[PDB]
Design a protein around this ligand. Structure first.
Ligand SMILES: [Ca+2]
Ligand SMILES: [Ca+2]
Lengths: 367, 370
């Protein structure tokens, strides 16, 4: 068993991870559960231990993108998840409410709070086989939207109690951030569907004007796009993220350290290099220090800017290379939410791409 | 040769920066009635080689309204939490103004212990033999920090608004404490509009309009005297919007120690008590307090983790130093379900609709941010 499929998947926002779903005592897996998607790899060791091999084939996009008719793919590890143990000592009804609000992971480990600096390390192994036109994020620092923060059809942004949000959810169903009239699904004969428990299968009817906070660009992403390796930092100071504000820097086009800005957002390419110059068939180790932008919540102001530092190290052609590729740069990075940020690595295939992706990741540490 | 030096400068900590000339010993501002006798630097009652602070509320010195109908209360206190001009240096131009309207100025200042963060405190009190046994006063308290854009509509919806949305509301609603009223302009006795120093209308509360905003509530921790008892009292409120009508408050007199009086959302615990007559008089009593705050789930309104209270008491009587572990590391509910945390005050807060005179000294404050 040179490669061992790891097919267990956790909906980290809406479910606790079972102990049997946890990988190496510190990870859970998200995205498509194909056997090939994620495998423990004993043929590509790092620091004397198995690495994780991630693979998305052409047909492996399972998710919908923002664009019309666009798709995306995901096979990732999350360092943030909650377990049964995390709910001990909370009210009995806490887990159920957490499922509905999608706040389960709020109760788990691996969250860097708002405003708290943290250092991170991880290593990546890019096969020579990897296509230069891949469109994939291989490591990202993800935010945690405020789950009872809503916008009414009339345009008022407000945060509700959990109980009030549960009331709203009786007649509104949210698809991502977008509210729709809640209805029950019919079969192809026009007869109501019942689920495994005998309940109606709820479905999104017409859009009803409601919004809830959901999604948004990741504060920090390492990836490849358009024949470029890139590191991109995003900031969003708006209390309720506006998903229609598509402030996103292009690795291809946007010059290094020249932020693309809207009223509320900023998107900075902190570093880039041609794909051809990225070392292949060797472990590349990144050491990342992050000082998050701080925000004023309902005031929507940036209190203090952030900072990013990145060192890159690898051994290639009988030479060890160490490059200070992000040299302690003042940068806007984070999201205006209550909760902070969590680390993921693997494959997140974006930009409406089905170009195959396969590489390995290992050696993660945060402190 | 100084004896007593009046400190009459007062700061509206929630709605104003403290001027440099209002700051006492580089670390305090004063709140409450500004009578000369209310607060004085006292060179006749030294503590650790330094002047203490003498606080005094006479019978006529209640200047505040209590919750109860026709009830009054009094205040002369120091706050360790306040904002200064320096705190707003380099901020957006309109930041201070919005902070004044929302009553969030002190959010930008020093002396805040964040939600969930443990902290140690120390202070000393000197109770004269003259102090009447039926005083009703809090001499040290740990105060919370309400969410200032958290409102309730006339229809009963609890919601937190953006600052901009709250500013819009504030155009036509004026809040008196937590209670919203139609905003109107005040007239003189002839029925002619008053103009302020800059020629603007003087705003006034008209009829109640159904709106509420978060304000007030019991202090998370209070040291005081009531009904002939010295007491330490811990309060917890897990409701997202504090309900002021929920009068969950323990009395030292009859409530047994460490047995909370509870509502659905609140708890009030007498952590310790002793008869007034047994409290040492005419000497400095030093308290060392360690606090672990209860943590709360914000809009979920649950208690995440309980808190803890430890209190040591030390003084010298006629013959020996006495040290008593009066609150021995007690698991306890203590805090408030708000975004912001807690700040220290000491002095006189005369509660329970009392006008019994109060005079004592306080000194020797330290918080070790640990
Ligand atoms: Ca947000
Ligand atoms: Ca509150």
């Amino acid at each position: 068993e040179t490669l061992v499929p790891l097919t267990k998947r956790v909906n980290v926002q809406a479910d606790t991870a079972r102990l049997d779903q946890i990988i190496d005592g510190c990870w859970v897996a998200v995205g498509t559960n194909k056997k090939h998607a994620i495998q423990r790899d004993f043929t590509r060791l790092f620091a004397g231990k198995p690495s994780y091999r991630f693979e998305l084939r052409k047909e492996d996009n399972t998710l919908e993108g923002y664009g019309k008719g666009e798709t995306k793919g995901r096979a990732e590890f999350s360092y943030c998840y909650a377990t049964s143990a995390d709910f001990k000592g909370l009210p009995a009804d806490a887990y159920r409410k957490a499922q509905i609000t999608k706040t389960v992971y709020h109760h788990g480990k691996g969250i860097c709070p708002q405003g708290v600096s943290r250092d991170y390390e991880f290593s990546v192994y890019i096969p020579s086989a990897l296509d230069s036109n891949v469109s994939t994020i291989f490591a990202q620092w993800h935010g945690m939207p405020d789950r009872t923060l809503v916008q009414t059809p009339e345009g008022e942004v407000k945060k509700l109690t959990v109980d009030e949000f549960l009331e709203l959810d009786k007649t509104t169903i949210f698809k991502k951030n977008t509210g729709h009239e809640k209805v029950a699904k019919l079969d192809k004969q026009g007869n109501p569907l019942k689920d495994k428990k005998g309940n109606p299968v709820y479905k999104a009817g017409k859009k009803n004007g409601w919004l809830v906070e959901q999604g948004g660009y990741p504060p920090l992403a390492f990836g490849f796009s358009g024949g470029w390796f890139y590191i991109k930092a995003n900031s969003d100071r708006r209390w309720l993220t506006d998903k229609t504000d598509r402030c996103n820097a292009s690795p291809e086009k946007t010059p290094v350290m020249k932020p693309v800005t809207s009223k509320y957002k900023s998107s900075t390419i902190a570093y880039k290099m041609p794909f051809a110059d990225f070392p292949k068939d060797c472990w590349v180790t990144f050491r990342v220090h992050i000082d998050w932008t701080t925000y004023g919540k309902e005031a929507e102001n940036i209190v203090k800017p952030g900072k990013l530092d990145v060192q890159m190290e690898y051994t290639d052609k009988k030479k060890t290379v160490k490059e200070h590729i992000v040299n302690n740069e003042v940068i806007q990075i984070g999201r205006n939410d209550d909760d902070g940020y969590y680390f993921k690595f693997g494959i997140y295939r974006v930009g409406n791409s089905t170009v195959p992706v396969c590489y390995n990741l290992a050696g993660y540490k945060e402190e």
